[PDB]
Structures are given as C-alpha cells and as structure tokens.
C-alpha cells in the first residue's frame, strides 16, 4: 500500500529569553523516527525508532549538521518575517515548515510537499508540480520572488521526486516489521447512564495501526452524526492509536443504535449493536 | 533523510 | 563520503574529445559537480547536476550522473588547448559539506 | 573575492602559524582544505557561520576559530612534516541560494626540522 515520509520543523522565537526554541521531527506513516531539538543536551539529530538506530555515525553526523541548518534558517526568518509584517521585537511568533514525499503501492513517487507557516497561517507552499510557489500576501510574494531567483524548487523538486523517495524505501526495508503492519481495531462497547430515562452508549476502537479510522454512530439506520460526541484519534502510547463515539439514548432504545467502524485492518465494516 | 538545501525566506 | 577518480592523467588531442569519468560511495550524496582547477590558483565551479537529472550541459561541457551506477562523468567536446587542468569531481551532502576526489590532470596537447 | 595570506612559508617542526582568510562576500560559509598529490582536497574545518565551526575529514592538527563572518584563520598549534602541503580556503552563502563554492588562490607550506 502508500506510504510516506514527512519532516516538521517548529521555531518559536523567544525575545529576550534567549534564541528561538526550535524542534524538528521525522515520521514514515504514523511513525516517529528522528528528532532534534535546541534545548536538549545532544545537539544531534537523534533515533526516536529503532530501525533508525541501526543507520551509521556518518548517518548522524550528516543529519545533525542539515538540521542544524534548518535551525539556522528559520533562527532567520523569525526576524526577516518580523520585518516584513512590521511585528515587535518583544513578541513571540512561531514559523513551521512540513515537507514530505508520498509513494504508492508500487513504491514510486506519487506527491511530493513543501509548505511553510508563520504563526498558525499558511505563509508559502510549493504548487503540487513541484516548480512553483502559492504565496499568501504580499510579504510571501517577496519570498515566493527570491526563491525563484535562487531556483529554490528546481532543487526541492530533486529532492521529493529523487531522495526523498530512495530514503522512505530504505526506511520501509529496514523497518519492515514496524512500517509494513497494520493492526485492526479492537472494538467494544460500553453503556453508561447516571438518570433513570438516559443512557449513554460508547463505542470503541483501541490498539488499531494506521491512524486512519472511521466511528459512526446510526438509530434505524439513519447516520446519528449531531447527536454523536466523537473525540479525536489519540495515540496509545505503543505505536497504535484510541478513538470512541457516544450516543446519549433513552431507555428501551438501545436495539435501535448501531456503531459502524471503518479501517484497513478490516475486511469488511464492523457494526457493533449493544446486545 | 532530510532536505539538504533550505534557503531563507 | 569517498569520491572516488580514478585515471590520474589524460591526454587527447586538440579538436578531439575528453571525457573524465567518476564514481562515489554515499547514498546521502544529493547534489553533483565539477571543478576546474589551473595551476598556482584555486578550484573553479566548472558545472553541475541535480540528483534527478541524467545529463547536463554548458557549451561544451556535458555532465552525465547514472545514480544506479553511482558514476558521474564530464564530456568535454570539443576540447581546447587552454582546457588543460586538473578537473575535480565533486559532491555535497547538503549544501555545507563538499567532497572531491583525487583530480584528474588533462592534458590537451596542440 | 577570497583572500588568504602568506602565499609561501617555511616553518621548522614545533613552529606555531596562522593562516589568513578573507572574503569581502558577506558569504556565511568558510571552509579550509588542503591538496596532497594522492588524494585531491580535503575538508579540515568549515563554519557556517560567525561564532561556529565543526571539524571535517582531517581535523588534527589544526585549530580555527570564526569571529566574524568575514574571517576564518586556520592555526596549526605546533607543525609537523606532515603539514606539508597547499591550503585552500573557500567560502559560500547557502541559505541564500549561492551553494556553489568559491575558493582562495591558495597558500604553499613546507615544513623541516
């Protein structure tokens, strides 16, 4: 099946305090597997999987030296950006940058990504052709025209399509084991109810890897989306993800709702009826 | 791996 | 991270054509070049190569990278006299880390 | 351009040197590296920038320090045979799209006992 290998850079600049907290992180799927960042003691890009750990020293020395590089460029861009919008130099302001590639099942490049942010709001983003830029305001603009001028994409796009890909496979290969799995949900259900006319019925789905998962909540048959409290996927802990949906339903109603899960590790949709 | 080439906005 | 040039010395005829060829180690190598280097006086950038491409060229100059391989090579049709140098092949691992290789003097004779 | 002086010098083995580097480029990056017949060039040191340096391929030896971005001198603390050789220094400006390197003309060194 797809796959995919993203990096998320973070940068928040700490007038006064000190230089900019920066934190970088690695991930092929919903697998973590480096990290670096500026306030711990290292100074290294170091192994947050182990399937990475078993990359060479060069692996590490090449890896610290490029995201410290990233560290540095965005150390930049905080204050060029401050200028640009006019900002204060008392405040705290956040860049981000995520940037990936995507393979399908036959491994081969399908999408490649580059997007950067300045204080929670989309700032810059390579076009899906991988040659152009989308710029948000005028201050993007200025960016968008400097890394035309430095031919910028032409390098990303060697990046994404070329080495971005070649790495995920080897990722992949060696983390066969971890990266190649996908772990079903293990549904269940529960039935609270503190009142003598409602009952509140939950509807789980825990130790399931991918993250992606769909949990509905149907009376007769008809979806129960505005009457559903759906809380957002989390993670276990382990390298698998949680997720449930409750329904309040009034006694003598239970038989009529149904509970519908949706993910890859099932062949076919479950329903779960509270019986 | 990681990019190799980030240029400054 | 070796860069690896083997054929110390070359030496073609004027007019006629010059090819200097090269192999590397690391996978982590993403950007590809050549250097030009003249005698009592530092390398010059002589031409490049992105890591997706498979031939690139400047008049005269025609860079051919075979990833697969790992060989990058450098045609010089047609070569000149003042062409004699020493080419270094080079590549980077990000853009703060240059590798070169042993060199290759080249010798046009007239 | 990049500048780096003395273009020749002889030193007896324990002698102390600095070697000078300057670029007028308001380049981010500087680099040293040294030239034997067997191995073409190879990295001492390199900074990427004002307050910061790393060690490269063949650090020992050699010390270098960055205290402007417009110098990089590279010391050899108390030479050695070994030490013989050209030194080339180079100097490039990465996070602005410049990551082609540019290298100075390069400083001859013999060392005897």
């Known amino acids: 099946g797809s796959h995919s290998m993203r990096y998320f850079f973070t940068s928040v600049s700490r007038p006064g305090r000190g230089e900019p907290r920066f934190i970088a992180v690695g991930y092929v799927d919903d697998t973590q597997f480096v990290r670096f960042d500026s306030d711990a003691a290292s100074q290294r890009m170091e192994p947050r999987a182990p399937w990475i750990e078993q990359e060479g020293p060069e692996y590490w020395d090449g890896e610290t030296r490029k995201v410290k590089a990233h560290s540095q460029t965005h150390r930049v861009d905080l204050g060029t950006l401050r200028g640009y919008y006019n900002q204060s130099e008392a405040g705290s302001h956040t860049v981000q940058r995520m940037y990936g590639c995507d393979v399908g099942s036959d491994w081969r490049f399908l999408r490649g990504y580059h997007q950067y942010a300045y204080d929670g709001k989309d700032y810059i983003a390579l076009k899906e052709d991988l040659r152009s830029w989308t710029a948000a305001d005028m201050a993007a603009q200025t960016t968008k025209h400097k890394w035309e001028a430095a031919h910028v994409a032409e390098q990303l796009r060697a990046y994404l399509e070329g080495t971005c890909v070649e790495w995920l496979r080897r990722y992949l290969e060696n983390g066969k084991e971890t990266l190649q799995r996908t772990d079903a949900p293990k549904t269940h259900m529960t039935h609270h109810a503190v009142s003598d006319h409602e009952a509140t019925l939950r509807c789980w789905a825990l130790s399931f890897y991918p993250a992606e998962i769909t949990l509905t909540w149907q009376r007769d048959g008809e979806d129960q989306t505005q009457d559903t409290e759906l809380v957002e996927t989390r993670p276990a802990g382990d390298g698998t993800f949680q997720k449930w949906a409750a329904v309040v339903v009034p006694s003598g109603q239970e038989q009529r709702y149904t509970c519908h899960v949706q993910h890859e590790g099932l062949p076919k949709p479950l329903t779960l009826r509270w019986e | 791996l990681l990019f190799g080439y980030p240029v400054y906005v | 991270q070796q860069v690896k040039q083997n054929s110390p010395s070359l030496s073609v005829q004027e007019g006629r054509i010059s090819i200097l060829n090269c192999d590397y180690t690391?996978?982590?190598?993403?950007?590809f070049l050549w250097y030009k280097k003249y005698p009592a006086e530092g390398p010059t950038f002589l031409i490049s190569?992105?890591?997706?491409?498979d031939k690139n060229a400047d008049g005269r100059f025609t860079v051919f990278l075979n990833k697969s391989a790992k060989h990058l090579s450098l045609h010089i049709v047609p070569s000149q006299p003042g062409d004699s140098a020493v080419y270094f092949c080079?590549?980077?691992?990000?853009?703060?880390?240059?590798?070169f290789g042993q060199g290759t003097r080249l010798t046009i004779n007239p | 351009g990049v500048t780096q002086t003395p273009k020749f010098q002889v030193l007896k083995t324990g002698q102390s040197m600095t070697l000078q580097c300057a670029q007028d480029?308001?380049?981010?990056?500087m680099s040293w590296y040294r030239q034997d017949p067997g191995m073409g060039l190879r990295l001492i040191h390199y900074?990427?920038?004002?307050?910061?340096?790393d060690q490269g391929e063949v650090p020992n030896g050699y010390n270098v320090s960055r205290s402007t971005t417009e110098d990089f001198p590279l010391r050899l603390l108390s030479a050695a045979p070994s030490q013989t050789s050209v030194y080339f220094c180079?100097?490039?400006?990465?996070?602005?799209?410049?990551?082609?390197?540019?290298f100075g003309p390069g400083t001859r060194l013999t060392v005897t006992e």
């Open positions: 180079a100097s490039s400006y990465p996070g602005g799209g410049f990551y082609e390197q540019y």
């Open positions: 690391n996978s982590m190598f993403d950007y």
């Open positions: 190569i992105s890591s997706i491409k």
């Open positions: 080079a590549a980077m691992e990000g853009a703060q880390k240059l590798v």
């Open positions: 480029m308001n380049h981010e990056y």
């Open positions: 900074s990427v920038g004002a307050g910061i340096t």
